[PDB]
Amino acid sequence: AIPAFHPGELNVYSAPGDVADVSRALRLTGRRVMLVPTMGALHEGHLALVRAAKRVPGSVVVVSIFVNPMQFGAGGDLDAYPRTPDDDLAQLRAEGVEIAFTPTTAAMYPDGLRTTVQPGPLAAELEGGPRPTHFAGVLTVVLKLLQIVRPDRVFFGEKDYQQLVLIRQLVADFNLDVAVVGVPTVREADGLAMSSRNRYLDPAQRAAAVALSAALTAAAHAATAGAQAALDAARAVLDAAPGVAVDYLELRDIGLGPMPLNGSGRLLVAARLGTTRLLDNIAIEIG
Amino acid sequence: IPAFHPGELNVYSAPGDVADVSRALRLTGRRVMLVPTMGALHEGHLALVRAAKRVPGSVVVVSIFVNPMQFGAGGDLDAYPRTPDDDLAQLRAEGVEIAFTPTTAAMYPDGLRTTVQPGPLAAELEGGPRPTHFAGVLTVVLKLLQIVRPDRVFFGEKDYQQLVLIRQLVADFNLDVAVVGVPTVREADGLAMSSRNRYLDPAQRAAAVALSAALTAAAHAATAGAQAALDAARAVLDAAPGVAVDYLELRDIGLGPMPLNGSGRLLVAARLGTTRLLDNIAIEIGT
Numbered sequence: 001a002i003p004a005f006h007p008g009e010l011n012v013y014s015a016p017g018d019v020a021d022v023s024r025a026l027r028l029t030g031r032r033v034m035l036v037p038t039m040g041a042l043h044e045g046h047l048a049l050v051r052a053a054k055r056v057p058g059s060v061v062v063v064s065i066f067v068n069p070m071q072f073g074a075g076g077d078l079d080a081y082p083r084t085p086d087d088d089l090a091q092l093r094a095e096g097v098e099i100a101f102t103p104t105t106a107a108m109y110p111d112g113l114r115t116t117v118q119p120g121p122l123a124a125e126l127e128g129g130p131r132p133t134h135f136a137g138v139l140t141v142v143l144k145l146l147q148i149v150r151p152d153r154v155f156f157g158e159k160d161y162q163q164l165v166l167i168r169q170l171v172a173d174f175n176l177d178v179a180v181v182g183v184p185t186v187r188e189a190d191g192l193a194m195s196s197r198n199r200y201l202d203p204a205q206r207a208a209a210v211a212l213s214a215a216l217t218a219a220a221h222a223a224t225a226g227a228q229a230a231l232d233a234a235r236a237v238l239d240a241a242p243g244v245a246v247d248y249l250e251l252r253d254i255g256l257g258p259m260p261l262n263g264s265g266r267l268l269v270a271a272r273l274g275t276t277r278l279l280d281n282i283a284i285e286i287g
Numbered sequence: 288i289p290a291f292h293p294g295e296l297n298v299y300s301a302p303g304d305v306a307d308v309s310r311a312l313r314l315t316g317r318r319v320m321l322v323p324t325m326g327a328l329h330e331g332h333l334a335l336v337r338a339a340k341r342v343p344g345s346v347v348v349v350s351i352f353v354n355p356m357q358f359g360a361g362g363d364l365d366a367y368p369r370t371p372d373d374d375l376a377q378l379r380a381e382g383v384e385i386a387f388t389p390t391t392a393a394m395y396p397d398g399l400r401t402t403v404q405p406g407p408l409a410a411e412l413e414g415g416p417r418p419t420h421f422a423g424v425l426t427v428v429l430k431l432l433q434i435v436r437p438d439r440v441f442f443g444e445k446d447y448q449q450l451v452l453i454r455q456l457v458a459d460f461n462l463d464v465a466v467v468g469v470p471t472v473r474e475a476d477g478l479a480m481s482s483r484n485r486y487l488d489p490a491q492r493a494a495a496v497a498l499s500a501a502l503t504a505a506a507h508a509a510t511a512g513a514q515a516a517l518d519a520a521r522a523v524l525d526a527a528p529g530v531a532v533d534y535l536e537l538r539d540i541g542l543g544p545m546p547l548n549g550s551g552r553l554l555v556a557a558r559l560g561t562t563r564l565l566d567n568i569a570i571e572i573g574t
């Protein structure tokens with residue numbers, strides 16, 4: 001028997017088999033299953049992903065909420081991770097989401113860490129520098145979510161651009177039959193990319209943090225003058241802010257390969273403010 | 288949908304072609320069965336084909352692809368037997384409707400980028416002296432399953448460790464496919480069929496019967512316990528001329544981090560000249 005599904009309502013399932021069965025049944029009923037993977041602690045950024053999925057005609061939106069231990073560094077703090085289950089589910093009901101998938105670590109990893117996904121070399125770069133096993137954790141859980149839910153489209157934020165690119169590689173490399181949709185970064189009024197981590201910034205840090213987005217947007221417009229102009233402009237803005245330890249500022253092509261001295265690219269930055277690591281990135285057109 | 292002629296063997300090289308045909312078949316009610324092979328087909332592969340063909344409403348897809356990723360060096364890859372015309376002739380005689388014969392470029396357009404990292408079992412037995420072998424097997428099988436999307440996939444028990452690892456792949460990545468293991472097909476004297484048996488000269492072919500004789504002797508000696516079973520097998524192998532045993536191990540059936548307890552699998556690998564042969568058999572201890 002297929003588990004119960006109440007249209008127009010938020011149906012919560014914790015068992016992978018249950019959401020797998022409902023997703024299959026729904027796809028056969030004329031719905032297009034959209035998957036929005038999350039680790040909970042939902043904010044406007046996540047809601048933009050939800051809204052992007054909702055607008056596809058015939059959509060039934062599946063939002064997974066799972067704090068994946070495999071992507072937390074040996075030093076990452078799994079237990080400190082924010083958990084607001086009831087509030088999360090309330091936001092999803094408010095958005096008209098019909099399915100929330102909330103598996104336990106045990107249900108997702110019943111045999112512990114055994115077969116896993118090994119990302120390509122891009123996973124050792126940029127964010128992979130301080131966290132070398134992070135993306136293996138991300139790709140492994142995303143592949144599993146894709147196989148459990150079998151969505152027609154899966155939605156990811158461009159905020160975590162390197163993550164997005166690596167998922168696009170996973171999909172191409174493993175011949176996955178799903179469309180990957182990247183959703184533009186949602187930002188606060190002054191440009192700061194929305195993130196659960198922003199609340200950890202004290203006032204001086206929060207004001208200084210505007211430098212990341214300001215540096216990227218200045219770079220985007222300075223780009224008519226060339227790659228070097230764009231980089232120097234972004235660097236000057238970061239240099240005008242106190243307490244912002246830049247870990248990297250790199251211009252690459254859109255797939256994160258070497259950036260041409262002309263054409264489309266992506267400028268990415270990461271910096272530490274006190275004990276908080278912030279990231280941002282932006283599309284760049286050179287020349 | 289590319290051309291498809293029912294009751295005839297349709298050969299497709301393009302992944303997109305077989306994927307479209309498979310989906311179209313799945314959509315009309317036919318159940319797609321996949322039999323992955325590296326060609327050089329013999330009666331053991333035909334038993335896999337026959338097992339697939341008897342599933343009601345089945346359409347059988349046999350893939351033939353000598354996967355470069357699972358070979359250590361170009362020498363072994365170049366040495367693998369290739370008998371394309373005989374392979375297709377045998378598939379036609381078996382009533383197979385689809386043969387999937389991809390090129391290396393179509394399967395690895397980006398070289399080795401995202402890949403499958405098998406669990407600890409891949410570093411043992413066959414994997415000991417070939418640490419990347421099973422990562423190559425699991426990566427290609429994962430890709431084949433995503434391309435073809437079969438309801439069931441068939442593997443021979445002859446390469447038992449491979450079969451176990453594929454069951455791990457399916458469980459660990461939540462793949463929606465049933466893995467079917469088919470009993471080893473043997474020559475009249477017990478020799479397990481293998482595309483490598485062609486490299487045994489008359490003397491070696493005669494001596495090679497020791498592997499299956501050792502295993503079956505062990506299976507019957509087992510009523511007296513594990514030591515008796517192992518010693519019976521060792522005695523047979525030791526009496527064989529020109530048989531160099533690589534390993535002879537008795538493990539729990541999952542070959543995992545579990546001690547042997549009642550139901551096991553006895554595995555052997557031995558070299559006859561430059562030809563390495565494998566065989567294995569079910570063992571019940573004290574039964």
Ligand SMILES: CC(C)(CO)[C@@H](O)C(=O)[O-]
Nearest residue numbers: 037038039068138141160
């Ligand atoms: C994609 C994801 C849900 C995987 O755990 C996580 O990395 C996230 O929220 O970006």
Ligand SMILES: CC(C)(CO)[C@@H](O)C(=O)[O-]
Nearest residue numbers: 323324325354424427446
């Ligand atoms: C499973 C397989 C087809 C993957 O290339 C190959 O290892 C084989 O023939 O056993």
